[PDB]
Amino acid sequence: ADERFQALLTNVNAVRAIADAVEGTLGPKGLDVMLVDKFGEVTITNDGVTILDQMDVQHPAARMLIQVARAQEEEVGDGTTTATVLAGALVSEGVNQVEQGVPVSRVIEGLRRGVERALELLRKQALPVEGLDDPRLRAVARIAAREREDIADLVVEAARHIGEDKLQDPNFKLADTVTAREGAENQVITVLVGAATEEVVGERERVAKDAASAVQAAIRGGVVPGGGAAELAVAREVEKLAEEVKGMERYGVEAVAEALKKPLRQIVANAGFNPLEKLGDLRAAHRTGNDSLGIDCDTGEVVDMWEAGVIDPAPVKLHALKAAGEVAAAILRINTIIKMK
Amino acid sequence: ADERFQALLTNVNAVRAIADAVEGTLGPKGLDVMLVDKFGEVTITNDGVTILDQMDVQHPAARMLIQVARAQEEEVGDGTTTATVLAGALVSEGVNQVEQGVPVSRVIEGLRRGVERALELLRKQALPVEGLDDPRLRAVARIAAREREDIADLVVEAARHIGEDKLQDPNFKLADTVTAREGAENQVITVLVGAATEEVVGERERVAKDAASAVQAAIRGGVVPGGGAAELAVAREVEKLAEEVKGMERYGVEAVAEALKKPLRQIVANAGFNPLEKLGDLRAAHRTGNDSLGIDCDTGEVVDMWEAGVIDPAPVKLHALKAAGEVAAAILRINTIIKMK
Amino acid sequence: ADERFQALLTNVNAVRAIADAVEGTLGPKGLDVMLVDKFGEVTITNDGVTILDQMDVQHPAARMLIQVARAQEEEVGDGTTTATVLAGALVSEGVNQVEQGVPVSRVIEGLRRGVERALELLRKQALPVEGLDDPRLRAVARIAAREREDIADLVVEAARHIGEDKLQDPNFKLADTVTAREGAENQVITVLVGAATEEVVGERERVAKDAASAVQAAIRGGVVPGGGAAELAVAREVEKLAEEVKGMERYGVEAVAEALKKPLRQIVANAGFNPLEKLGDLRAAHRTGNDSLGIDCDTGEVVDMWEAGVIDPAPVKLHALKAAGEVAAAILRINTIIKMK
Amino acid sequence: ADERFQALLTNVNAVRAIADAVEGTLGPKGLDVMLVDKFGEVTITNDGVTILDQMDVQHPAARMLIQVARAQEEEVGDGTTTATVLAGALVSEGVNQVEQGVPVSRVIEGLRRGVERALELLRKQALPVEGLDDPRLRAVARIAAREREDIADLVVEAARHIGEDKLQDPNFKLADTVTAREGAENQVITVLVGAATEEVVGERERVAKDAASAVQAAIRGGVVPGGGAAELAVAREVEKLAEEVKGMERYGVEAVAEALKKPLRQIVANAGFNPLEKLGDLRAAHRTGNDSLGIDCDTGEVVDMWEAGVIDPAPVKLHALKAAGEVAAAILRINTIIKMK
């Protein structure tokens, strides 16, 4: 019986290691990682899609988390860091509950329903955007642009150049229509992203792709309050369902409720504030009945996220949460480790 | 800085060790404790008063807890076990919150307000007695008599002889009017408590005092749905206070919210049941708007505590929680250890 | 003499180890197992057919168990995991009896007679299916298809198309008449099973044959209550046998009696409930004289097996118990281990 | 949690060691025990009272068992060995069930109900004696007299001298009226028991009192098939009850059912036969439905105990089983050890 738990705990540590490396890059004030080789080259990066693509993974269970994370990229092309962090948080809280005495099978079925209601509420709370002239598209473009307005303006201009129904096509991907060249300017003709030298093209094309996918998802799925505020808004209701669920199976719902707060906690931690008090003081304005406010990362004061302009696409967070729940369930479902024939 | 926390942990572990050796006697299906000497004498007792009286204490933090608990006993003559267990839980999760990074003063000042609202709501939940012929006095005598009916009837029979307005006299302690003699019968004259042999006189005398004090308090303060149900009922509202309180300080209100679960948790655990599943399944019937429901100690089925016939006095629980809060606040405040002259 | 028993004990622990690896996959809420290579590839599988194919078996006592398990798979293509988890229980209880002082040769014939009367009573308890219009066909198809109704419907829709006497042909195998192709829909023309991608065909083709074999076995041998309830039912009759067998040899009949409870015990354990408490109350529900009372696998309350709708074919369990008896007999007779040229 | 169980295991081993030190003296072919000192003085004896009154006890769990076992002697004056061995078996099986996962409080109440049930069936099964000249009164004195008829005959000769109603009172016991003097012949004047030398007076007086108590009990409450047959008779009924108890509580009832077989197991083991086979062929002979079959101590052939004459009085066995159940419960309750002032 201890060996079965040790099998799960060994897999959990592999997942937590992947989340540990990529959870420091969350939010608008994230931190970058160092990637080194035996030959000695360096790759400074803060975009998690590059971190997961260019990380040495040897433990068998870690590969599944990256597989789902890049499946999300195949879907819409953004939000892999959030999915990895949520999956790590879910698995960590699940193993914490199992160590408390809950059987793993009960935690899995609790986690399933918790993620189900969380997706339901995130879908409900997503507010649609009225036309491409709305400033919320500028807001969601700037945040995907790493707070560089020069790239941000040319993607939103291109979006209004194309149109609404042409953007609604599911067979068309805007990320295939972005190209970056060196020594050029920023304009739309297929858009051209200017770069200084050849080495600057690689990251500029990446951020152009990210902004393209953000504005792509914004029109179809609407708008959700970013910065982890939506996660807290759904976490409160998931806790209500945890009080609603009967039996030992509820403690998976509590695990989903706690795991949903990890994005906001890591955003405030990366912003250079103490998470445990900034999470406490954030609950003051959540008593007012409005569930669209969080914390800004520059002054540490509680402010509503519509006015602050910290916005996230609805499909990115919805799919990130779905993938995180699916992989957390899949990695919790393992009980034994065996060597092949 | 670690030395200031190290001194807190040693104070905590002394308090915890007192509670771990007393908490097993809580509830109707409690278990006894064996006490040994260098001479090897045996003292089998399940009453917390005697175990706390005769137990060796060397760590100064432990002495304060039993001084507070026995002053509580000097007040009304019962409830020391519940107070000690509650103090242990409060101190344990006080240090648990500090381990997470919360400052100690914030936890202290959160414990203060949590205990304040818990006392207020336990006062408001206490239901008064409608005359002394009410069967709930039979119930509160029966639980105080270790579920032995021969002691349960004579204390209520004597009490109805005394009356009411003579019973509310604060200078009158009814537990001083009990005397047990070997080989006698059961009657009032002074309630004469029969016993088989001389050695049996001590435990019967102690049980007579316990039942006498229970019925004494039942008229003064009314009744509360016991078995840990009332502490759960006020724990829910203390959790609402925690969601109402601002800043880092709210983590102490959460500590009070959890510490009120420990009596019911350890009542269920001592019954031979899994406390996790039974605490999970007990929140179902609390959604109906009623807050007077608990769990039985024989079948494991969730039943209403008024009809289940398990009731405890109001002042005993009130003052036990007050003493537990006061001693938790007094013991979390210490930060350093120095030798004297 | 110690060497003879030690040479047996090393054989038992091999059958125990291979049984332990697949015991977690039993039941509708089973847990998957990952199979790592030297090169690091992984196969997540919850079916017991594949885990035995793709695992090292170096201690040759396990080779006999895998050989007889796949030999069992050859007739009716299902229930190999039940066969090996019953074999492990029988062998473990037999060696436990041998530890008490019973010689092995007595336990061998006790096992023989107990398994014989267990086969007799599990055959008798089987209830024939009323045509192909009976919804028990849907019930037995859904369970074999991992509780996925989309694949469950097509197998029984085809089975309607084949007929009664054409399915009753012993030389005709309907598991060869199921084929899976990627990118297609589900229809019967040959049963075509749809799949998303090429990698999804590998598992869909497997579960198609499993579901096909379930409905094939159902017509031949009728229906038996699943979830381990039938093994619990025949266990009591084996216990009644044990009191009738004269001499030291009966204790093998006790080994059969205790081993037949292992399926229900492990299905309950994998479900996330306590096996002892949830198996004790089952026999308390057997007072009515009916032998179908089993346990639901998400609420944990005892429920009559037929009405829950989770039901398993009769011949698969018949031959699984026969194979478990054959291998438990075969392994126990091995007393010495030596080498060749 | 481990310490609470380890505190029980040290208490269990003390009881087991006491029972293990007097288990070989049970039955008509019992084996003596050698006591030693620092001075080297030694006493050879097989009367368990003379061992338990003299062997050294330092673990306080053993002193309670000897206290209640000698209280049984104070009540009647015989059957202390069976009380001790039953207490040991009950405690050993209680801890065996706690090892599996049953909480101690559940086993405790299961044991309580099992012992109450066993007392009820022994009360029913104990048939009365028809007059004083019935040969079973000769037989009970014979077994009480270490299979020597010289002491047995004078006891029944005195018993007819006193009278039936004179024996019926509780205020008078003829265990005190027996007196042994050296150099005297066997006659009654005061039952004068002859002895060879002064040293022979001690054990002869002791066995005279034992035989006196045996025939006291025989008229007082009748007779019960001894040699362990009656405990096997009631153990089947306790096993039948075990299947009716709901939930986790039953495993105490199974412990009571098993612990009642330890008496006959030890009579057979001390006799020089394999207990496991001679229990199987005994329970295989109970097909007729009668509850008087046992095993003879000279040939090992299964015979009815009435014809063999091996008989034991009813009240001694009833009180021994009651004391064994009470002490097993009271030693199972203990879960924590502390040093006192």
Residue numbers in the entry:
A (entry chain N), B (entry chain E), C (entry chain O), D (entry chain F): 12 to 200, 356 to 507
Could you share sentences copied from the article?
In the case of ACIII, oligomeric structures were visible in the absence of ATP, and they all formed double-ring structures. ACIII assembled as eight-subunit double rings without ATP-Mg²+, and AFCB formed 7-subunit double rings. The 2D classification of particles of the four ACs revealed that whereas ACI and AFCB formed heptameric rings, ACII and ACIII assembled into octameric rings, mirroring their modern counterparts. Regarding their overall structure, a typical chaperonin double-ring structure was observed for ACIII and AFCB. By contrast, ACIII and AFCB did not require ATP for either assembly or stability. Group III chaperonins, found in some bacteria, resemble Group II but lack the nucleotide-sensing loop present in Groups I and II. The remaining chaperonins E. coli GroEL, ACI and ACIII exhibited similar hydrolysis patterns. AFCB and ACIII showed similar patterns, with a small initial increase in LDH activity before stabilizing at ∼75% activity after 35 min. The evolutionary progression from an exclusively single-ring structure in ACI, to a mix of single and double rings in ACII, and finally to an exclusively double-ring assembly in ACIII, suggests a gradual, step-by-step evolution from single- to double-ring chaperonins. This pattern supports a timeline where ACI is the oldest ancestor, followed by ACII and then ACIII—with the latter likely arising through horizontal gene transfer between an ancestral archaeon and a Firmicutes bacterium rather than being a direct descendent from LUCA. For Group III ancestors, a notable increase in total stability appears to be driven by strengthened Van der Waals forces and reduced backbone clashes, indicating enhanced hydrophobic packing.
Chaperonins are essential protein-folding machines, classified into three structural and phylogenetic groups: Group I (bacterial GroEL), Group II (archaeal thermosome and eukaryotic CCT), and Group III (bacterial thermosome-like). All chaperonin monomers share a common three-domain structure: an apical domain involved in substrate recognition, an equatorial domain containing the ATP-binding site that drives the conformational changes that occur during the chaperonin functional cycle, and an intermediate domain linking the two by relaying signals. Using ancestral sequence reconstruction (ASR) and protein resurrection, we inferred and experimentally characterized the last common ancestors of these groups (ancestral chaperonins ACI, ACII, and ACIII). We selected several AC nodes for protein synthesis and purification, including the last common ancestors of Group I (ACI), Group II (ACII), and Group III (ACIII), along with the ancestor of the Fibrobacteres–Chlorobi–Bacteroidetes (FCB) Group (AFCB).
